[PDB]
């Protein structure tokens, strides 16, 4: 029944709004001058970077990098709260639950990162600030190319014009992979994902009826996520070797194995 699929979609959207304080709908209202929300202080160089705490509640590159790192640990926390709400996920073997998160968590971070980006920069501090792509790329090596592959993806991805009710099901599909390395019981995972994929497919054609093959173009985007993740991992191993004094969160170290 299509009707059970819509109920699942409604359930996941509601759980996505409850788990993530900054939705794409809010992010786009901030980014584009809407009166439902307020304007971000823009950071484009070092003076505005230090002017930035005068509005938004060590060297500059390592400080920015370690805040982006604190934020990621926070998103991991929000993603795990979302994941538990995906029907059947808490019912799986605990070891497989850990494996799905470990491998799914960064692909979801960069999907939702895209909600907070345009070609020019990225919202920070829950929408209160905006950090210019040009500033980030001007950071000293090896940090200037830290964010550029996320912007390249985001610009391509934001072109699909997905909204939060689409994204809620898509990030569920990402978690419930079943081709993840080290999974004990693949088949229960594949059964949950086949359901999510049916819910996503219906959602896309009801919400985007004039968008030809949007289901397939979005599933292809999963290729770009995998490559962002693997590049970021390699870049981190270079930062850790040249910056032996920069501390990495154990939660992120446990995932990066
Ligand atoms: C590289 C892409 C990116 C993503 C998110 C952020 C953020 O920074 C947004 O969320 C925030 C904002 C501000 C801080 C302050 C940090 S935190 C600390 O430990 N000392 C500080 O100055 C922490 C987190 N930046 C960059
Ligand atoms: C985004 C510019 C403000 C820098 C520090 C913001 C507060 C730090 C935090 O929330 O962890």
Data resolution in angstroms: 2.5
CB 204 within 8 A of CB 10: no
- Name the token pair of 196: 């999510």
Distance CA 126, CA 177 (A): 29
Name which of 251, 42, 231, 255 is nearest 146 in CA terms.
Answer: 231
Does 67 sit in the ligand 1 pocket, CB within 6 Å?
yes
Burial class (CB in 10 A: 0-12, 13-18, 19+), 6: middle
Specify the residue with its C-alpha closest to ligand 1, atom 25. 68
Question: Where do the domains of the chain lie?
Answer: 1-257
> By three-state DSSP, how is residue 178 classified?
coil
249 is in an annotated binding site: no
Does 124 sit in the ligand 2 pocket, CB within 6 Å?
yes
Specify the residue with its C-alpha closest to ligand 2, atom 10. 57
Count of beta carbons in the 10 Å neighbourhood of residue 51? 14
CATH topology of domain 1-257: Retinoid X Receptor (1.10.565)
Name which of 122, 100, 253, 249 is nearest 181 in CA terms.
Answer: 100
């Amino acid at each position: 029944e299509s009707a059970d699929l819509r109920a699942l979609a409604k359930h996941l959207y509601d759980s996505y709004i409850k788990s993530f304080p900054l939705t794409k709908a809010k992010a786009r209202a901030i980014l584009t001058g809407k009166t439902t929300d307020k304007s971000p202080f823009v950071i484009y160089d070092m003076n505005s970077l230090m002017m930035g705490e005068d509005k938004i509640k060590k060297e500059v590159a390592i400080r920015i990098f370690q805040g982006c790192q604190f934020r990621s640990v926070e998103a991991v926390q929000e993603i795990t709260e979302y994941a538990k709400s995906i029907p059947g996920f808490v019912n799986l073997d605990l070891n497989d639950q850990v494996t799905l998160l470990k491998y799914g968590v960064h692909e979801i971070i960069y999907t939702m990162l895209a909600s907070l980006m345009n070609k020019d920069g990225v919202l920070i501090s829950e929408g209160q600030g905006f950090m210019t792509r040009e500033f980030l790329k001007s950071l000293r090596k090896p940090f200037g190319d830290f964010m550029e592959p996320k912007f390249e993806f985001a610009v391509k991805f934001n072109a699909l014009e997905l909204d939060d009710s689409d994204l809620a099901i898509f990030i569920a599909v990402i978690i419930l992979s079943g081709d993840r390395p080290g999974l004990l019981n693949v088949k229960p995972i594949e059964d949950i994902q086949d359901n999510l994929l049916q819910a996503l497919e219906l959602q896309l054609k009801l919400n985007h009826p004039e968008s030809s093959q949007l289901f397939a173009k979005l599933l292809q985007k999963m290729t770009d996520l995998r490559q962002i993740v693997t590049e970021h991992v390699q870049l981190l191993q270079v930062i850790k070797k040249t910056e032996t004094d920069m501390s990495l969160h154990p939660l992120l170290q446990e995932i990066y194995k």
